[PDB]
Design a protein around this ligand. Sequence first.
Ligand SMILES: [Mg+2]
Ligand SMILES: [Mg+2]
Ligand SMILES: [Mg+2]
Ligand SMILES: [Mg+2]
Ligand SMILES: [Zn+2]
Ligand SMILES: [Zn+2]
Ligand SMILES: [Zn+2]
Ligand SMILES: [Zn+2]
Lengths: 268, 244, 244
Amino acid sequence: MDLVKDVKRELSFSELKGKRVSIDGYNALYQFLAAIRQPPLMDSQGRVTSHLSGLFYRTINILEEGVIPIYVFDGSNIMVEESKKLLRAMGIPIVQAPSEGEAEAAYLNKLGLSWAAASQDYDAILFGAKRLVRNLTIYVEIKPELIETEILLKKLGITREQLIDIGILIGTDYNPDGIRGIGPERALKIIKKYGKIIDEIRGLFLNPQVVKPEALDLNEPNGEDIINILVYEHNFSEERVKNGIERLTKAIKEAKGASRQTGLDRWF
Amino acid sequence: MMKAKVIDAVSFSYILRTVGDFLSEANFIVTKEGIRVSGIDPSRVVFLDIFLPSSYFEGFEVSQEKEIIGFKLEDVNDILKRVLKDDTLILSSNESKLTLTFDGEFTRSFELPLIQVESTSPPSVNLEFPFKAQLLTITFADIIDELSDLGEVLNIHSKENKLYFEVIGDLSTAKVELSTDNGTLLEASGADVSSSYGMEYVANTTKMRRASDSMELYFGSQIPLKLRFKLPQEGYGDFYIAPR
Amino acid sequence: MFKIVYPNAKDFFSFINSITNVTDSIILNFTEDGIFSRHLTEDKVLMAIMRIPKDVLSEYSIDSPTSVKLDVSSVKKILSKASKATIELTETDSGLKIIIRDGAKSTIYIKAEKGQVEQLTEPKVNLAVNFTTDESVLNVIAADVTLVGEEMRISTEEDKIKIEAGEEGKRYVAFLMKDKPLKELSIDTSASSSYSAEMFKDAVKGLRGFSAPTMVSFGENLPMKIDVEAVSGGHMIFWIAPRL
Ligand SMILES: [Mg+2]
Ligand SMILES: [Mg+2]
Ligand SMILES: [Mg+2]
Ligand SMILES: [Mg+2]
Ligand SMILES: [Zn+2]
Ligand SMILES: [Zn+2]
Ligand SMILES: [Zn+2]
Ligand SMILES: [Zn+2]
């Protein structure tokens, strides 16, 4: 565990309909690389095409539900680039982060340009994300999961500065494994009593390198660029795409529509 | 610019609904003499020639010598599927749009952008058939809609002025006798062809029942099956089907 | 404990079936003022409200306003499993009993969790435009719009109501006016508003089962309220949130 200091509620796609979501590019890709395997999914030339299968099949699944997806990349690097070239060709908005993708994903949410950051990891919270949605990328039916920072901080009775310090005691990427022999629960207790007495690591979370985007809108998906990186170079089956690329653009009509939708609760 | 008002909009609907079983795209070729819709299907087995005279319409005008209105059939058919019982359809067209308006309890019109579609017709007929038969469209639609289950191929023939509709299915072949001494045929002449046809092609013309009271049937050995569904006010819906 | 009597069981079932178009799990509220039911979809786009004022009921006997959550699907599916008659609600230890007296008589027992009476939180806004018409008119338009696009645009146009839909060059236009077909029309100010075509269809679809007319009301970039008063006195309402 890295964060199990959570009581969080699941959310139906109903509540998520008509919402821009700051999906982490890198996190999404690994998930797609680690999940779907038909016979890693290979092609004719003998390379992994599993990243593309996710970006194609799951993103339509997302758009058909009403979620406007924004993939955020930071910086094989060619796998990432040919993931971007697909997303440009699909029309789905793309944002290049100055350093940390999830920090940018948090910042887009913080600017009100996204409703929430989406990742399987919790790092977005520590970068100032208002909300974190899990399980978009991936009895036990896996439903979307929502963590609200405002509700989290109130229930644990801490501030954002404090959660960062707890993150330090648990372990971030800047301090992998954190302080040994202190877990989440012990970290929470410690900071709830004091305030940490790495002095730079705080600054990497509080105020990291992020950009105002300058975008972020759904464009028309053209096939003359989609087929080139899917059906040929990385060898996909066009038979599936014909009925799939067709529902892609068809999903945009309902997705961009839902974006304009007002809530009946602004007249209560 | 073209304007044509159709009183029996539901009937009109069934004409175009048939064409849609054969064609995905067609032209309304509107002239001072009337409105023509024709074309060949992708498999090249069926050519259809449907003419609706100016008198078929309740008030009809065309500003030019000829006007070509290109439309996707399923789009027009879906619109036409929204017709009400008491409604009257009015077709108009301008520089860019084809408009279909239903007028009844209230007015509601649908617009579709003009489409470019190849008017190749033809290319089929210089034909004289050895056998011709007149019958009510209703009874034709009974025989075919109840025979359409069995067989990919409808093999019909004539003998002693009597017209026999045979289909060879999985277990046994069932045949239907149509004659004037029977009650199903009105008039018939000629001798003595035996041909077979693609069952799906014939069965797809049966909705013309809802648009035509009587019809003519022309056939011959080695030559096309011509169905001429007589339409109101001297109109006609021609369907040539190539032989198997 | 309670006793409620409604003079018309036909309309009672209609209310239940109407809310079912939204939640399939109804929750009635027995207040001092009467009965109501209010479900708000998880997207907060659409809201169904049933309200039957106390004076409209044959008998209304309570002492304490309570809530009754009908045992989700199963129970609300046992109700609509029943069919001119009166209907009676009475309290059981673990739910409620229903008597349908027609001089026939039937009783279906329902297990239902009881609780604290809820609020009737409803959009607080002024709609400058409203009109009355049949349900059939509303159904026609609803089917017409969803056929053409995802979005509907209702607006005032001189002494007419103009309904529009259309995605890419292919549009739909409908005109509604006094006597054609509107029963009554009131335009306080010019108003234009866009709504999800599907959402309009769902709301309209949930208003069949009443011979009574239907009031539709909107404003400039405001929610649309559509309601029917049942012949016996109740009120079924649908609110639809606009697009901006
Ligand atoms: Mg990261
Ligand atoms: Mg470790
Ligand atoms: Mg004559
Ligand atoms: Mg409810
Ligand atoms: Zn992870
Ligand atoms: Zn002979
Ligand atoms: Zn619906
Ligand atoms: Zn009232």
